[PDB]
């Protein structure tokens, strides 16, 4: 817009899921010059919304895609491209250089992080209206880590969560309050939380939610709430029973609110929830040792009631199919009385379950809610591994 | 809750065909797929391939690219292993598991299981043998009595020592096979008060040869 963005409005009634966005990258990257890529996302304009994603300086087909099972590298660099087309050669805006990123806009323009570096040495830059703005060197020293996913901005303030430190126990996350660029504020991790990684945001009635990663020992989602006003968080677990992470532990019959719910250590895959009172949707891959499937489940009240079973629920990708990663986004500037909600599932193809291949690349599927009760379908990748033997 | 029961055991000739056919119930079957295993005696468990019960399509291991063939009749539920030309080293046991994950990686919940006798022997039926004893006092005010079940082929036999209900204190053996046929005994322990007062029977049972028997052990002595 010309002006900043308000998260004015709430959440509109989640009643099941329309599909917004579909890529088929994979399918046609077999005869087109797309891009490999990884940690893919969606985060709207004012204008239009984008499929971001870090791409890893190859195409599926080139011979240098073969060992992009590796997460970081100097190849890697966020890049952007219109709804619903592949991440192609040719269409493909590069937006920063490096292997973590988030990227929001403020109504007036955005902001892209992009982290760079050696594990033990690395860097952010922030760059707003496409110029370097702001840089924050490592803390920790082992990998600085962000969002994977876009971030939400209030009146030109826009939290952006940073871990640095170790996957396997305690690390440093810091809350960031950035507005146009420079740093306003920031604070350190503060709550029941144990660890973070991660964070899938959305924003709504002027305030911040963030479903993130417990990679040390959760196995429930932990959730940080951030007041992008007056800038301060705090953070405790999705108390539900219905275990959302992945690897997990089945299901219990009570679960935790302000601690990790114990069984599957040193893991997770980043995901996502809707947290509304009676309106909340939460969604985990079907299989619980493996990313495959992926489903939402309506469980009023999973943030707050520590046995809420689902009551709705939805199949998005099949559980005989792979999903990946999760995330929320919505289109901030769409018109209405509120907030249409929408998150993406990454869909890894590749190595390493699919190792007769030497890539690992990735599709998207999109989906937004609709108040409606439509009616659902499963949707794959669909590519068929043998087609690039 | 998950159950899959499989078919009955069989026999065949060298170079045969056999559809061994794994039940699904519990869940719901077209979003988990079908994991085949191979544990043949002297070596152990072998993943075979997995079937995607939603597209049909079947993944093999190399070891079984070629005989092997994975169908499933979707309707009833039911994935079915076939094995055609049956090469000798297809005696073995055929487990059928739900795959948990995409591909089978988990295989949580297996089928009992189901042995393919691959053998160019005939089927004989029993001789079931009532073995009461030379006397001899089996321990302190305890008798033990046998029951040889010789000359049967091929495996298995149920043996019972009165309609299931002699429990404890029965040994059935495991059998062996003597080239053409195998042999079978179970002995059971029973205090003086009991035998030769109440009957104690033997009742075998080879389902193969439609042969049932109870050979009631007769104090003879
Ligand atoms: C047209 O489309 C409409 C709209 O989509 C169709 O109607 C929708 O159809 C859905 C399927 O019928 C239905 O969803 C179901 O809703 C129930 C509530 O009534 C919900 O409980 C179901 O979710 C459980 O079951 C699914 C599989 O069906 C599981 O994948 C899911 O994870 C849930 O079960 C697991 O978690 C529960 C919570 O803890 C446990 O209670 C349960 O034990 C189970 O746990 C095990 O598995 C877990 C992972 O899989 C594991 O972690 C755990 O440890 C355990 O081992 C399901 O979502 C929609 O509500 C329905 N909507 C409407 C409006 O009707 C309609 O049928 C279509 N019509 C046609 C003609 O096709
Ligand atoms: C690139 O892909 C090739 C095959 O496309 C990989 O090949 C293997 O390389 C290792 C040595 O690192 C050998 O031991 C294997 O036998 C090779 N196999 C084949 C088919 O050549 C190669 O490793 C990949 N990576 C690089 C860095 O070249
Ligand atoms: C945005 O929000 C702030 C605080 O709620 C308010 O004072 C400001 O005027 C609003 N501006 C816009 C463009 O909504
Ligand atoms: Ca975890």
């Known amino acids: 817009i010309r002006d900043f963005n308000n998260l004015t409005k709430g959440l509109c009634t989640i009643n099941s899921w329309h599909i917004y966005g579909k890529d088929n990258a994979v399918r046609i990257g077999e005869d087109s010059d797309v891009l490999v890529t990884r940690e893919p996302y969606v985060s709207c304009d004012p204008d239009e919304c984008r499929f971001y994603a870090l791409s890893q300086g190859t195409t599926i087909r080139g011979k240098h895609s073969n060992g992009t099972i590796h997460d970081r590298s100097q190849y890697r660099a966020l890049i952007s491209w219109p709804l619903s087309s592949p991440p192609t050669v040719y269409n493909s805006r590069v937006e920063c250089i490096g292997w973590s990123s988030t990227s929001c806009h403020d109504g007036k323009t955005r902001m892209s992080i992009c982290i760079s570096g050696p594990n033990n040495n690395a860097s952010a830059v922030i760059w707003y209206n496409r110029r370097p703005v702001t840089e924050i060197n490592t803390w920790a020293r082992n990998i600085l880590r962000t969002q994977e996913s876009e971030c939400v901005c209030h009146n030109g303030v826009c939290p952006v969560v940073f871990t640095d430190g170790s996957a396997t126990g305690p690390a440093e996350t810091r809350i960031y309050y950035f507005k146009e660029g420079k740093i306003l504020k920031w604070e350190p991790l503060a709550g029941t939380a144990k660890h973070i990684e991660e964070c899938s945001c959305y924003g709504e009635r002027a305030e911040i939610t963030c479903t993130c990663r417990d990679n040390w020992q959760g196995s429930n989602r932990p959730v940080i709430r951030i007041d992008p006003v007056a800038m301060t968080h705090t953070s405790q677990y999705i108390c539900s029973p219905v275990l959302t992470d992945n690897p997990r532990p089945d299901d219990p019959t009570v679960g935790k609110c302000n601690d990790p719910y114990p069984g599957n250590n040193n893991n997770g895959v980043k995901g996502f929830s809707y947290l509304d009172g009676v309106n909340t949707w939460l969604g985990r891959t079907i299989s619980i040792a493996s990313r495959s499937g992926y489903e939402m489940l309506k469980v009023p009240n999973a943030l707050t009631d520590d046995k809420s079973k689902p009551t709705q629920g939805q199949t998005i990708v099949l559980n005989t199919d792979w999903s990946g990663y999760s995330g929320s986004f919505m289109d901030y500037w769409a018109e209405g009385e509120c907030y249409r909600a929408c998150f993406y599932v990454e869909l890894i193809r590749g190595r390493p379950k699919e190792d007769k291949v030497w890539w690992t690349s990735n599709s998207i599927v999109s989906m937004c809610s609709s108040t409606e009760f439509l009616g659902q379908w499963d949707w794959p990748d669909g590519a068929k591994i043998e087609y690039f033997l | 809750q998950i159950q899959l029961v499989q078919s009955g055991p069989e026999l065949k000739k060298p170079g045969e065909t056999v559809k061994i056919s794994c039940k699904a119930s519990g869940y719901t079957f077209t979003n988990y797929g079908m994991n085949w295993v191979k544990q043949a005696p002297g070596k152990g468990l072998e993943w075979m391939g997995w079937?995607?019960?939603?597209?049909?399509?079947?993944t093999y291991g190399e070891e079984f690219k070629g005989r092997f063939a994975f169908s499933l009749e979707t309707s009833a539920s039911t994935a079915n292993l076939q094995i055609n030309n049956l090469k000798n080293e297809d005696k073995a046991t055929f487990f059928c598991a739900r795959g948990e994950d995409n591909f089978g990686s988990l295989s949580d919940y297996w089928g009992q299981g189901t042995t393919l006798t691959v053998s160019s022997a005939k089927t004989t039926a029993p001789s079931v043998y009532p073995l009461a004893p030379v006397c001899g006092d089996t321990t302190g005010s305890s008798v033990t009595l046998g029951c040889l079940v010789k000359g049967y082929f091929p495996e298995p036999v149920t043996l019972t020592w009165n309609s299931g209900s002699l429990s404890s204190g029965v040994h059935t053996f495991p059998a062996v096979l003597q080239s053409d046929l195998y042999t079978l005994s179970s002995s059971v322990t029973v205090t003086s008060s009991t035998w030769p007062s109440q009957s104690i029977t033997c009742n075998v049972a080879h389902p193969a040869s439609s042969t049932k028997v109870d050979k009631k052990i007769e104090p003879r002595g």
């Open positions: 079937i995607n019960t939603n597209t049909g399509e079947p």
